[PDB]
Design a protein that fits this description.
Two copies of one chain form a homodimer.
Chain A (H helix, E strand, L loop, with lengths): L10 H4 L2 E6 L2 E8 L2 E5 L14 H6 L6 E5 L2 E3 L1 E7 L2 E6 L8 E4 L7 E8 L2 E9 L18 E6 L2 E11 L5 E4 L25 H13 L13 H10 L7 H6 L1 H7 L3 H14 L18 H7 L1
Parallel strand pairs in A: 8-12
Antiparallel strand pairs in A: 1-2, 1-4, 2-3, 3-7, 4-5, 6-7, 9-10, 9-11, 11-12, 12-13
Helix pairs in contact in A: 3-6, 3-7, 3-8, 4-7
The structure holds the ligand O=C(Nc1cncc2ccccc12)[C@@H]1CCN(Cc2nnc[nH]2)c2ccc(Cl)cc21 (2 copies) and chloride ion.
The site of one copy of the ligand O=C(Nc1cncc2ccccc12)[C@@H]1CCN(Cc2nnc[nH]2)c2ccc(Cl)cc21 has 14 residues of chain B, from strand 12.
Protein name (chain A): 3C-like proteinase nsp5
Subunit structure (chain A): 3CL-PRO exists as monomer and homodimer. Only the homodimer shows catalytic activity. Interacts with host FBXO22; this interaction promotes the proteasomal degradation of nsp5.
Subcellular location (chain A): Host cytoplasm; Host Golgi apparatus; Host nucleus
Chain lengths: ~300, ~300
């Protein structure tokens, strides 16, 4: 019993964290096999940063301009290429701690663990969701660039995020491990603003099923709703629309607890209308949206 | 920017997790050097738990009754001894992944990371506080017994907790790595209840400084208070008393933000008597008490491990 925000054990990712230095910039790299992946902005001189031509800047670099450090050992860079917004530094040593891994691009609402690093050294591990506006609400200071987001597929690490930047509101933006940004963001200092964030409705419903499994039932009601009536209400509270895919995904939790999805949907409508009235759900006074249906089933 | 509940990187502890099987019970063990530590209740069946004589049960066991598995390799148990509520299985092979480590007993209010395991396999890592009532509000299913709580000090893992059981309210009880329980709990299937929990006041204050560092200032007020007046108000809302040690510990955060500890206490006093008024602090509608002052400085400064 109990319900916690839980990250994946970070050990397999720690063995991959290295420090990447290019001129005056030092950030983190992900060393997998004989390749170190890191944000391409490591080649910028904070003058290039506003409108950088990364192809032009990388063409002027040589392998000896990149200093890669894995622990107390300097790695030798023997090649450099760019895939979208990620820099790939080919090294002359394969990482012996390379786990079984895969590069996955995730969708909004999906959760993942972040291994926050500074100077190629892991300092903390936490849990995130890809916000509907494609930002992540992380905890990152200067030097965290190159920190990665991942999930563990029972032995295999699926890398889904690399941290690139912090937006003016303190939220974070980055890319998949193929360098493609999540969201309408670019790796430039140009004026960028995240869209208005919304609540991940399917995740809130998943978390309400976690509360029911844990014995919390006070928010349950005798009502059901149509999916369209629920979406009309939920959207007025800045909640994401719930699709038929989401309803289907909540099926196993619906079967486990005996509460139909549209029945739980009516509980959610009521909570949005009334608030909590001094009560908590799973020790929280707000509706939690960073637990997916897959996370709830896994944890419970 | 940002503030998250953050655990220590679990890598050094993952290399120590093994599966311990004794008869029909399977749980986790912590393999450090040539010894595997695990809850002594692994030697018990459903009948023993009602009233077990652990010395009598362990005397009837032989080294071959314990099956220790580190990954896909079976370890050979060459000795067995008991230290309080922990079982120590001496093995023929020293763990090559043994990190620099130390066994430490923590105090209520202190936080630590939990590496939740099942069948000697780590499945999740979460950060939690040792509640003032000595329970932990964990997330554990059957088979999690033997999962450990730790902190990382430079490059040294300080093991502070081993999970033993779940109380009727869903909260958890366990011991330090020397087998001594945290709290008035025993390792037996008996009617046990946790005491009434209280809020870790120093941690709430530390978390209010984290909110100020992150730009959330709405709760700040012009007022200050005496430590005695604050404690009289805090005692009334089931908050732990704040000692001069706590005030001193909050000193660096007080200096960093320009808000004196008793000045922040006056904000906390108002938050207690008046509530949040529909507002949030760090995205939370409740005052968070599972971040110590050291955790806040570490997170808002980037200390690495
Ligand atoms: O923002 C970044 N990384 C950081 C990551 N996480 C959390 C942070 C918290 C405080 C500071 C920096 C943080 C870096 C470096 C700084 N600046 C901003 C900038 N670029 N020139 C002028 N100012 C930019 C701008 C664009 C890009 Cl792609 C990357 C970056
Ligand atoms: O409670 C325990 N451990 C668990 C840990 N974390 C979370 C759990 C969630 C669901 C179930 C079990 C959980 C075990 C096993 C169960 N039983 C009760 C018992 N009664 N007859 C024999 N065993 C007891 C009783 C006492 C002790 Cl010390 C330990 C234990
Ligand atoms: Cl401090």
């Amino acid at each position: 019993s109990g319900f916690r925000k839980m990250a994946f054990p970070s050990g397999k990712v720690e063995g991959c964290m290295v420090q990447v230095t290019c001129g005056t910039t030092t950030l983190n790299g992900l060393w997998l096999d004989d390749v170190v992946y890191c944000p391409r902005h490591v080649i910028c001189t904070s003058e290039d940063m506003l409108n950088p031509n990364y192809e032009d800047l990388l063409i002027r670099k040589s392998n000896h301009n990149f200093l890669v450090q894995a622990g107390n050992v300097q790695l030798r860079v023997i090649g450099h290429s760019m895939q979208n917004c990620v820099l790939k530094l080919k090294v002359d040593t394969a990482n012996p701690k390379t786990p079984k891994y895969k590069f996955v691009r995730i969708q909004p609402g999906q959760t993942f663990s972040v291994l926050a690093c500074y100077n190629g050294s892991p300092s903390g591990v936490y849990q995130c969701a890809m916000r509907p506006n494609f930002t992540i609400k992380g905890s990152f200071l200067n030097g965290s660039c190159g920190s990665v987001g991942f999930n563990i597929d029972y032995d295999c690490v699926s890398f889904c995020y690399m941290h690139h930047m912090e937006l003016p509101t303190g939220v974070h933006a980055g890319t998949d491990l193929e360098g493609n940004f999540y969201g309408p963001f670019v790796d430039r200092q140009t004026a960028q603003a995240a869209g208005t964030d919304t609540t991940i409705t399917v995740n809130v419903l998943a978390w309400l099923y976690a509360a029911v499994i844990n014995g919390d039932r006070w928010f349950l009601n005798r009502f059901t709703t149509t999916l369209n009536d629920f979406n009309l209400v939920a959207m007025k509270y800045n909640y994401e629309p719930l699709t038929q895919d989401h309803v289907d995904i909540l099926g196993p939790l619906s079967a486990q607890t005996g509460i139909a999805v549209l029945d739980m949907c009516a509980s959610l409508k009521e909570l949005l209308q009334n608030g909590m009235n001094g009560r908590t759900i799973l020790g929280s006074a707000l509706l939690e949206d960073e637990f997916t249906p897959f996370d709830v089933v896994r944890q419970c």
